[PDB]
Amino acid sequence: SHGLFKKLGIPGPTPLPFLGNILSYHKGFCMFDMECHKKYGKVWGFYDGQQPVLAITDPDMIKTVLVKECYSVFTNRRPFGPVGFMKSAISIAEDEEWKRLRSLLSPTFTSGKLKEMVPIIAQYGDVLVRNLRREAETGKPVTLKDVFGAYSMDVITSTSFGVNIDSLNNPQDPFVENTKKLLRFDFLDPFFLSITVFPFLIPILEVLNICVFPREVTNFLRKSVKRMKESRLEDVDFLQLMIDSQNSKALSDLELVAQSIIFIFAGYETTSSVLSFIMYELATHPDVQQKLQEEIDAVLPNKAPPTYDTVLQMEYLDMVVNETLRLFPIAMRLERVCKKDVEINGMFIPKGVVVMIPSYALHRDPKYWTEPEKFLPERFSKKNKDNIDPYIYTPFGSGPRNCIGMRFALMNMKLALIRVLQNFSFKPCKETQIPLKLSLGGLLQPEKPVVLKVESR
Amino acid sequence: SHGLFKKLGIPGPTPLPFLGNILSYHKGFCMFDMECHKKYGKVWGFYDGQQPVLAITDPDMIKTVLVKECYSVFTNRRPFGPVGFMKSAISIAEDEEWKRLRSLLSPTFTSGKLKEMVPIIAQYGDVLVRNLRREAETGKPVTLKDVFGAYSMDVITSTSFGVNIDSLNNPQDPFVENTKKLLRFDFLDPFFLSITVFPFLIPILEVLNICVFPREVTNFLRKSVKRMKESRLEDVDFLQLMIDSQNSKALSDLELVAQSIIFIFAGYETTSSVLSFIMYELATHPDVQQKLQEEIDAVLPNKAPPTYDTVLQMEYLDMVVNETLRLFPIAMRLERVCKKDVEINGMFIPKGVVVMIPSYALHRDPKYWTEPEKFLPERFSKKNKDNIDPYIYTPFGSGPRNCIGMRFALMNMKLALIRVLQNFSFKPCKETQIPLKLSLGGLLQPEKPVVLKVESR
Ligand code: HEM
Numbered sequence: 001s002h003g004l005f006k007k008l009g010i011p012g013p014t015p016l017p018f019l020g021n022i023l024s025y026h027k028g029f030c031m032f033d034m035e036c037h038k039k040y041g042k043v044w045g046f047y048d049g050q051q052p053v054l055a056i057t058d059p060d061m062i063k064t065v066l067v068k069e070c071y072s073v074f075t076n077r078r079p080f081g082p083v084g085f086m087k088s089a090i091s092i093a094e095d096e097e098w099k100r101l102r103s104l105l106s107p108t109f110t111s112g113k114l115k116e117m118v119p120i121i122a123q124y125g126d127v128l129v130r131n132l133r134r135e136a137e138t139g140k141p142v143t144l145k146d147v148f149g150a151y152s153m154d155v156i157t158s159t160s161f162g163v164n165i166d167s168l169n170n171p172q173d174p175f176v177e178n179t180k181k182l183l184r185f186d187f188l189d190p191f192f193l194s195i196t197v198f199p200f201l202i203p204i205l206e207v208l209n210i211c212v213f214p215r216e217v218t219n220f221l222r223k224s225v226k227r228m229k230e231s232r233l234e235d236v237d238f239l240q241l242m243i244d245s246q247n248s249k250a251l252s253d254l255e256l257v258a259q260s261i262i263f264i265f266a267g268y269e270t271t272s273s274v275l276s277f278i279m280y281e282l283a284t285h286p287d288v289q290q291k292l293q294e295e296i297d298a299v300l301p302n303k304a305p306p307t308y309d310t311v312l313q314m315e316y317l318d319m320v321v322n323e324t325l326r327l328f329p330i331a332m333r334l335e336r337v338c339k340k341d342v343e344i345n346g347m348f349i350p351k352g353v354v355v356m357i358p359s360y361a362l363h364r365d366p367k368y369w370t371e372p373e374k375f376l377p378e379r380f381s382k383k384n385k386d387n388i389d390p391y392i393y394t395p396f397g398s399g400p401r402n403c404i405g406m407r408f409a410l411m412n413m414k415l416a417l418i419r420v421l422q423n424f425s426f427k428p429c430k431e432t433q434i435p436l437k438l439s440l441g442g443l444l445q446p447e448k449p450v451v452l453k454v455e456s457r
Numbered sequence: 458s459h460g461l462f463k464k465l466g467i468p469g470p471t472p473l474p475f476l477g478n479i480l481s482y483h484k485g486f487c488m489f490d491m492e493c494h495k496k497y498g499k500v501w502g503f504y505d506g507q508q509p510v511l512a513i514t515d516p517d518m519i520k521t522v523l524v525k526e527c528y529s530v531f532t533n534r535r536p537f538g539p540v541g542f543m544k545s546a547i548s549i550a551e552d553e554e555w556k557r558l559r560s561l562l563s564p565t566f567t568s569g570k571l572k573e574m575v576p577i578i579a580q581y582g583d584v585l586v587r588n589l590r591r592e593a594e595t596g597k598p599v600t601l602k603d604v605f606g607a608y609s610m611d612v613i614t615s616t617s618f619g620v621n622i623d624s625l626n627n628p629q630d631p632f633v634e635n636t637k638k639l640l641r642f643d644f645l646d647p648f649f650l651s652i653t654v655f656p657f658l659i660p661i662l663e664v665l666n667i668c669v670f671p672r673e674v675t676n677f678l679r680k681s682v683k684r685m686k687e688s689r690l691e692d693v694d695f696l697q698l699m700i701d702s703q704n705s706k707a708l709s710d711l712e713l714v715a716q717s718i719i720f721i722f723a724g725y726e727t728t729s730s731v732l733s734f735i736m737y738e739l740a741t742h743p744d745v746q747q748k749l750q751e752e753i754d755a756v757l758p759n760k761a762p763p764t765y766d767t768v769l770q771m772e773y774l775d776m777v778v779n780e781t782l783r784l785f786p787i788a789m790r791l792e793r794v795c796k797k798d799v800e801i802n803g804m805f806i807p808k809g810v811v812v813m814i815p816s817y818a819l820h821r822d823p824k825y826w827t828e829p830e831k832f833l834p835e836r837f838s839k840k841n842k843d844n845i846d847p848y849i850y851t852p853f854g855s856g857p858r859n860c861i862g863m864r865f866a867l868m869n870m871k872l873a874l875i876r877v878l879q880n881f882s883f884k885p886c887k888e889t890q891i892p893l894k895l896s897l898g899g900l901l902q903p904e905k906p907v908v909l910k911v912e913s914r
């Protein structure tokens with residue numbers, strides 16, 4: 001099965017029996033993609049175990065794949081390990097079902113519903129600040145993914161179930177506990193590599209009701225949600241919107257829970273990780289930090305509370321965000337399974353092949369980015385923003401299966417930063433990893449957690 | 458493979474292909490054993506999946522199995538699911554290795570080392586009491602396995618690593634968290650039944666570094682212990698004793714950790730569960746409660762602090778304990794794998810057969826116990842204690858592979874009760890499950906958690 005790309009005349013690294021090329025993940029996904037990109041060019045193929053994966057780097061062709069042919073051919077992602085009842089979550093479902101879920105859930109993530117979510121996201125901004133100042137006045141360097149996680153948690157809990165925790169001060173609350181155990185899967189830990197040399201074990205683990213979503217976290221939320229559904233009904237958040245939806249093809253009950261669980265993860269270690277990266281940059285780039293706090297004071301004088309509207313009135317802030325997402329696209333890769341034999345942009349691609357877009361690699365490709373390793377937000381200036389190909393820069397994917405939560409994430413994030421730079425400036429500690437090396441793991445997160453210094457303006 | 462016992466002319470329930478008799482676990486292990494015991498008599502066999510299990514109820518024969526032939530034939534328990542590096546813990550190791558571990562670890566559990574452990578076990582008695590009185594003065598019915606667990610935790614943490622937590626007030630402490638996730642395996646949950654219809658999947662999960670001991674709890678303790686070992690060395694608890702041992706065949710480092718992890722579980726949900734049962738009895742039997750608080754006041758006047766010595770001076774207290782253990786032997790069953798063809802007490806038993814002693818069933822067998830469903834501690838009076846066959850009553854097993862921690866458990870437990878009945882009396886609430894129905898699950902724990910009323914003497 002390792003002859004495939006040789007036949008198609010597509011170049012790539014020589015696979016080992018059974019292993020395919022996975023030994024080459026010893027420096028993380030990202031480093032492997034850049035290296036293939038340099039060595040082979042615009043297209044290459046390789047083998048996660050026996051599985052052909054075809055990498056592509058042409059924007060037309062990438063558009064063809066994420067847009068033009070999404071429904072017909074490229075509808076789904078690759079399977080990755082036993083998910084149990086979580087089979088039914090939107091990010092994991094296939095074909096007509098996913099097509100369906102997207103619809104049931106899409107209204108929920110509208111700008112308009114989002115704007116109603118703003119003042120709740122506001123209140124925990126106050127918590128974040130107050131918690132920070134306690135560490136600021138005790139001049140002790142601060143690990144971010146803690147205080148940001150604690151914030152990221154409060155937001156989720158509240159924005160999706162109305163649960164109102166100071167999680168940084170109550171990691172004791174059974175709710176907060178469960179919710180944390182939902183962490184970014186280390187796709188390069190002992191498990192998933194084995195899942196990829198031995199995917200024939202996925203059904204094995206399914207019938208064994210083994211689940212990558214801790215059977216306890218899920219058995220908790222499942223019945224947790226079942227209590228909420230029956231206390232609201234009858235006596236603004238995601239659950240409401242989703243409960244409203246199934247009040248008609250309409251969403252189910254177990255289905256509803258598994259969606260919640262997705263939303264819960266997503267907004268947690270992603271929102272948390274990204275902010276960490278941003279403060280790392282804001283910290284190792286004092287001028288950018290300052291220009292930012294200048295925007296926030298001119299659009300919002302006197303430490304004025306942000307509204308929905310004033311947030312989007314802030315362009316530089318957006319630039320910084322975008323630029324950070326370029327440097328750290330926490331997905332690293334987009335993928336779609338080729339469900340039929342197809343020709344796209346004059347290239348034959350056979351069924352079962354997994355088509356991959358190496359986002360990380362593209363973001364640091366010299367050919368589109370001057371000095372791509374540098375952190376330069378002016379890349380995304382209203383002037384320069386026009387020159388950036390949407391199929392090269394894809395922090396949130398693209399097409400019918402892009403990040404459904406994109407607007408909410410950006411709003412969520414921006415809301416925190418604004419309230420954080422209104423009060424504090426962030427400075428590198430002797431202990432701050434400079435330069436920030438990347439987790440050679442299967443996560444896009446830093447090698448070492450970001451520690452900085454926090455001062456009260 | 459389902460013909461075995463029919464050939465040997467040994468009676469038992471008819472197995473279904475693949476399933477064996479496991480459909481008959483729908484009412485828990487215990488109920489199935491009593492039923493086989495009544496229906497077939499002194500011996501019977503059945504099939505957990507394709508695995509022959511031979512049950513026996515003859516004391517001679519049970520002695521033969523747990524004692525006389527332990528080394529030669531019956532050295533090990535049955536495998537149960539993927540344990541990863543935990544392969545090396547004493548309760549799980551096989552043959553010469555276990556034989557070895559027992560020796561390295563046996564001194565640790567001496568009465569004499571135990572006596573030095575007493576005053577530490579004392580101090581958290583004070584915590585237990587103070588926490589209780591807070592709920593006592595707020596006349597709100599109390600779930601036991603919480604406050605007892607919280608106690609059971611404090612003891613372990615301290616008695617094995619010197620870690621000194623008020624865990625009831627700090628379930629936030631990363632240590633306490635990890636430690637809790639080590640809970641009594643529900644052998645009748647979705648997993649282990651599948652493990653028993655599909656044991657050929659155990660090696661499957663091994664190579665997948667999948668572990669029944671949460672890979673995170675273990676990766677925590679592993680490095681947690683590695684920090685302690687290197688802070689003590691160089692600058693009274695189980696770790697010390699074990700560290701001392703490997704200071705010579707001597708214990709290893711990973712080995713040392715996996716032992717700790719065992720000790721940690723054992724003293725947790727076992728100590729916790731047992732006390733829960735005892736207060737349930739003490740509660741549904743006011744007179745027994747009173748006689749007890751009378752012993753504790755005569756051997757220890759003026760709420761006198763218990764010493765090692767005064768504890769064993771208390772006989773009734775011991776009786777109550779024993780009697781409770783009769784009613785609720787939390788192991789339910791003892792097992793040993795027959796590693797060779799052998800004849801014992803005039804019975805042929807083939808290799809690979811799993812020999813089982815149905816402790817629960819024996820404890821409620823009428824033929825040894827008058828009114829066995831009743832709770833009557835006078836059964837264990839210094840007068841009557843002589844009539845109890847040690848091979849019928851086996852709460853802690855027997856022979857070279859009995860409960861290594863037996864003395865410590867009994868001491869641990871007794872120390873708590875004494876300090877608890879010195880201050881409080883325990884009364885049934887309208888909500889108290891009366892009579893206490895048993896978890897039809899694979900655990901010996903109650904159907905419903907015990908809730909009682911707590912009053913300040
Ligand atoms: C900065 C934060 C986030 C980033 C960078 C991000 C990025 C992504 C990416 C790269 C994808 C793959 C899309 C594709 O294949 O084209 C995706 C999918 C998805 N995202 Fe996010 N995301 C973020 C936050 C969130 C949040 C807060 C939610 C809340 C629900 C969310 C929900 C989803 C869902 C449900 C999918 C799968 C959508 C589908 O298959 O229909 N994401 N995201």
Ligand code: HEM
Pocket residue numbers: 523547548549559719720723724727728731786787788791792851852853854855856857858859860861862863865866867
């Ligand atoms: C009331 C509490 C406890 C009860 C009822 C209990 C009961 C048992 C039983 C029934 C066995 C099986 C023995 C056999 O097959 O003959 C056992 C084994 C064992 N117990 Fe416990 N136990 C208790 C507490 C503890 C504690 C606190 C420890 C602390 C380390 C401990 C450590 C062990 C170990 C290490 C084994 C396996 C011994 C070996 O295979 O060599 N137990 N226990």
Ligand SMILES: C=C(N[C@H](CSC[C@H](NC1CCCC1)C(=O)NCc1cccnc1)Cc1ccccc1)OC(C)(C)C
Pocket residue numbers: 077080091092182183184185187262263265266270331403
């Ligand atoms: C392969 C996935 N995830 C899906 C299929 S598994 C469910 C998924 N997370 C899981 C893992 C953590 C607990 C929930 C999701 O959907 N989480 C919401 C989310 C995450 C990140 C960004 N936005 C939303 C397909 C996919 C792959 C990459 C990026 C996005 C989706 O991702 C990881 C590499 C595992 C992090």
Ligand SMILES: C=C(N[C@H](CSC[C@H](NC1CCCC1)C(=O)NCc1cccnc1)Cc1ccccc1)OC(C)(C)C
Pocket residue numbers: 534537548549639640641642644719720722723727788860
């Ligand atoms: C089958 C076992 N356990 C051993 C083999 S797995 C390791 C074992 N617990 C594990 C499970 C919870 C986290 C540690 C042990 O050794 N825990 C110490 C202990 C427990 C209870 C009483 N004393 C000591 C063999 C065995 C079976 C029954 C009773 C005792 C030992 O037990 C259970 C039915 C699973 C509860």
